[model samples]
Every structure is written in structure tokens, then in C-alpha cells.
Target: MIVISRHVAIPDGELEITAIRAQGAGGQHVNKTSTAIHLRFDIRASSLPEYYKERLLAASHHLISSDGVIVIKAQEYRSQELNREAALARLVAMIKELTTEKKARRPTRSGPSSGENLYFQ
Candidate 1:
């Protein structure tokens, strides 16, 4: 199980990990060995709370596919183990970000004395 937080734990079976060659710059080693880790997690299918699902989808639309799968690629290291760790870390970080509550904006009246209004006046 992947422990996302005290409240959230994702089962190992839910994650799809693929070993693919790391793209760009290296010679034979890069071509021969698959060091990159492609991690895919389907948020909609997970056991995560509804709140977490909504927040994650809304905040990280770029990372998620139209199918609601979160795709993360990690290839910073030469070793597959290191790359795998990095990928999981990134996934956890993304999930952790939704744990915080965003402060709601309160509307403030901009009077004539307001700096921007005064400049325009």
C-alpha cells in the first residue's frame, strides 16, 4: 500500500508501473537499459475521499489525462530503483498538496481612495 497521508492510503494494485527507456542525451546505456519509470494512477477509481479527488482533479488538470489518470515520469537518475523512488515521491507530493485548505478570497470594495483607482482618477 502507498501511504499518502494519515487518511489516504492507495493500494499497490491500483498503481500501474511501466519500465521504459529514458529519453534524450545518453549513449548505449540509455538505449539498452530502461531506467525511466512511468507511473499511472487512476484518481477516479481510487479509494481516496471525494474531497481529495475533486481537489486533485481541479488543481492538477495538466498532470491528469482526460480519462482521470495521473501520469508521472521519473528519469533523473541512472538507476531504475532511484527513478522509481522519484516517481513515487512526486506522486505523493502531488497528492499531499491537496491536503491543505485554500483560504477563500473575500471581496473588498475598491473606493476612489484605493491606490489603483486614485491613479486612474
Candidate 2:
């Protein structure tokens, strides 16, 4: 199970984790071991609130697919377990970001301030 936030938790069945070979330079060790972790979660199918889903989709369009699947790749560590944890951590961070309420901007007058108005008038 993946805990996105205090109110949102995604079931294990909802995640599609794939173990693939780590790319880039690492000699034979990187070529032999499948340390990279690819995590896929469908936003539409998850248990997240509708507001969270919309925020995540809009904020992370590059990470999400047209079908609403979020794909996260973790290959920072040589160990598969570490990579898996890194991927989950990233997923949690993304969801947590959406939990914060956005502050709305209030309209302000276009007139100059007191100091500037003194010179203008």
C-alpha cells in the first residue's frame, strides 16, 4: 500500500512497478542488475480526491500520460529496493504538493503609492 497523504492512500493493486536495467555508465554491474524502478499509477483509478486529481494532472502534465497514468522512474541507487523506495517517495511528494491550498490574489488599485503620488500630483 502507498500512502499519498493523511487522507489518501493508494492500494498495492493500483500500482504497476517494473524492474528494468539501469542506464548510463556503471560498467558490468549496471548492465547485469536490474536496479531501475518504473512506477505507474492511474490518477483516474486511484482513491485520491477529485480536487487532488485535477491539481496533480495540471501540475504534473509531463509526468502524466494522456490516459491519466503517472509514470515515475527511479534509478539513483544501484539497489533495486532503494530505487523502489525513491520512486514511492517521489510519488508521495507529488501528491503532498497538491494538498496545500493556493492563495488567491486580490485586485489592487493601479494608482501610485503615497510616496510616488506626492511627486506625480
Candidate 3:
């Protein structure tokens, strides 16, 4: 299970991990080792709170698949352990970022010159 916040925990089952050979300029090492971690979390299927789910969906449009799965790929590191850590760290950061409450927008009239009527109007 991954802890998203003080009150929210995402179950381990929600994450689907796939290890594939990383494609890049690296020579033999990259060809042989499957170090890349592809993590997918389905927002619609997760056990997260309604507000968090909504916020996550709204904030992350790039990661969201047409089927509602959130895809995260981590292949920056050469080692499998480092890649795994990167994936997990990214997941934690994304969840933490999306779970926060947005500040309410209060409408205001802004003008260069407004008389006393601006206060009441």
C-alpha cells in the first residue's frame, strides 16, 4: 500500500507495474536489462476519496489514458532499484500534489477609477 497523505492510503493492488527494456542511445547494457518501470494506476478503480479522485483527474490530463488509467514511466536510472525508487517517488509526489485543496476564487471589481459606488455595487 502507498500512503498518499496523513489520512489517505492507496492499496498496492491499484498499481500495475510492467518492466520493459528501455530504449535509448545506451549500447549493450540497455538492450539486455529490463530496467524501465511502467506504472499504471486507474483513477476510476482506485479506493481514494471522491475529492482526491476528482482533483487527480482534473490536474493530470497527460497521464490519464482514454480508459482512465494513469501511466507513469521511470527509466532515467540504469539500475532497476533506482528506477523503482523513481517510480514510487513520482507516484507519491503526484498524489500529494493533487490531494491539496484549491483556494476559492472570490470575484472582485478592479478599475483604475471607481467612486464610492464601487463599494456597494
Candidate 4:
């Protein structure tokens, strides 16, 4: 299972990860290797809590498809393993972003933009 937090976690298979060839220009390494990670997470079909589903679906991100599917491509790395890791981390980062929801109850809570700088302290 990939755990985003104590409250939010998603089991395997729910996150369908695929290895596809990279699109841009490159040498034999890029031409021969399907190192890019094609990650797709269907919010409606996931085991995530309703709260998570709601927030996730409500989010307007380019990564999320129109039909409530989160689609991201990770190929910043060369090797498949590294690209896979990048994809996984990207997925986690997307899910972790929900903490920045506009659920702020206090007006004084005005702070830095949506949920930045709290990952450390």
C-alpha cells in the first residue's frame, strides 16, 4: 500500500502503473527503453476515503483527467527504476496536497499559498 498519510492511503493495483517509452528525442537508451512511468489513479474506483475522493475530484489539476482519473508521466530519470520512483513520489505528492484545502475555518489563517513549508516543522 502507498500511504499518503495516517488518514489517507491507497492500496496497490488501485494505482495502475505502466512503463511506456519516452516521447522526446534521445539516443538508443531512450529509443530502446520503456523507462517512462505512466501512472493513472482513478479516484472513483479507489479505496480512498470519501473525503479524499471528494477533495481529489474537486481539485482542478492538469494531471487529473476529466473523468476523475489522475494521470501523470514521470520520466525525468533515465532508468526505469528511477522513473518508477519518480512516478511514485509524484503520486504521493499529489495526494499529500489535499491538506491545503480551503477548509480553513478562521479568516486569520491567511498564510503562505496553498500548504507550503509545513513538511518540516
Candidate 5:
């Protein structure tokens, strides 16, 4: 399970992790071992509040796909365990960002300027 905060916790079953071969350095080892971790979380299906879902979707547009899946790629470490931890950390950060209480928006209109009622004709 990933503990995002005191109130938000995501079970392991909710997250779908896939091991894919990462590109870049690591020589031949990179070709054989799929150390990169792709973590996917579906926001629409989660048990979070509606406001949270909206804020999260708006704030994390880069990480979230068009299908409403939050995808995080972790490949900094060669070990799967480290990569998994990194991925979990990223997820926690994303959750924390969405958990904050946002200020309510109140719209207002400007008053009309003077001399508008009379044309002096």
C-alpha cells in the first residue's frame, strides 16, 4: 500500500505496475533487465472526493493520460525495488498536491462609469 497522507492511502491492488526496459545508459544490462517501472492509477475509479478528482485532474495533466489514468515512469535506479519506491514517492507527491483545500472562487463585476446615461445632445 502507498501512504499519501493521514487521510489518503492507496492499496497496492489499485495500482497497476508494469516493468518495461528503460532507454539510455546501463550498457547491455539495460537491454536485458526491465528495471523501469510504469505505475498507473485511475482517478475516475478511485474512492476520492469529487472536488479532489477535479483538482487532481487539472493539476496533473502532464502525468494523467486522456483516458484518466495517472502514469508515472521511474527508471533512475537499476534495481526494481528502488524504482518501485521512486514510483510510489511520485504518486504520493501527486496525491498530496491534490489533497489541499483550495480557495473558493467568487466572481464580481465592475461598476459602470459616470456620464454614460447622458449623451449631451
Candidate 6:
């Protein structure tokens, strides 16, 4: 489950998690063990928060399929458990990013002859 703070989280049904073989340079271990995690989820699901769905649907991130799905392949660790944790955390990190409020930018008045600073040094 993905916990994005109080009362907001994703249930098991909403997530698609599977184990796949980890690829790459490790010879003996890599050839036999399925250490990788193939994690996927839909952005239009009902299990997640409404704000999460809305923000994710409009996201321009490459990980998002834009087909209402987001995919995260976690294979950094040698163990499947570690990879699974990484996948869930990764998704949570993304959700929190959008969940947090953004601050509006204000222009600084540093130019001479400005309304606030009419006198030039």
C-alpha cells in the first residue's frame, strides 16, 4: 500500500506489482534470480485520492504512460523485497510532490525610478 499521509493512500487492488528477472552484469546471481520489480498503476483509479488522480493525469513526466498508467521498474537491489519497497516509495515520493502546496513568485523591485524607489543613487 502507498501511504500519502492521513486518510490518503492506495490499496493493494489499485497497484500491480510483480517480480521479474533482474538484468545486467552480475553473472551467477543475475542469471537465476528474479530480483526486479515490475510495478504499475492506473491514474484514473478510485482507490487513490481525487487530487492525486487529477494532478497525475495532467503530469508531463516520462514515467507516466499518459494512457492512465504509470510504470516504475525497480531493480536497484539484489533482493526482491528491497526492490518492492523502492517501487512503493518512488510512487509515494511523486504523489507527495504534487500534494504539497506551491508558493507564488513575486517580482522584486530593484530598478531605479521604480514606483516604490523613485530616487536613483
Question: Per-residue lDDT tens digits of candidate 6, residues 52-94?
Answer: 7778777765567666777777777878888987888768765
**Which scores greater on TM-score, model 2 or model 4?**
4
lDDT (Cα atoms) of all candidates against the true structure: 0.69, 0.68, 0.66, 0.69, 0.67, 0.68
By summed lDDT, the worst window of 10 consecutive residues in model 2 runs over 112-121
The true-versus-predicted C-alpha distance at residue 28 of model 5, in Å, is 15
lDDT of 4 at 43: 84
lDDT of 2 by residue, 1-121 (tens): 6775567787667788888774577755444455688898888887778987787776633566655677778877768778877888768765665555443453222343221111122
* Candidate 1 C-alpha lDDT tens digits along 42-103: 88988889987877777633566655678788877878777866888778866665555443
**Residue 6 error, candidate 1, Å:** 2.2
For model 2, what is the alpha-carbon lDDT of residue 70? 75
Task: Write candidate 5's Cα lDDT for 33-93 as tens digits.
Answer: 5668878788788876677677677663456665566778887876777787788877876
TM-score of each: 0.63, 0.62, 0.62, 0.67, 0.62, 0.64
Residue pairs whose backbone atoms clash in candidate 3: none
Runs of candidate 2 with Cα error greater than 4 angstroms are 22-34, 99-121
Instruction: Tell me which residue pairs clash in candidate 6.
Output: none
Error of 6 at 64 (Å): 0.5
Angstrom error at residue 27, model 2: 14
Cα lDDT, model 1, residue 68: 64
The candidate scoring highest on TM-score is: 4
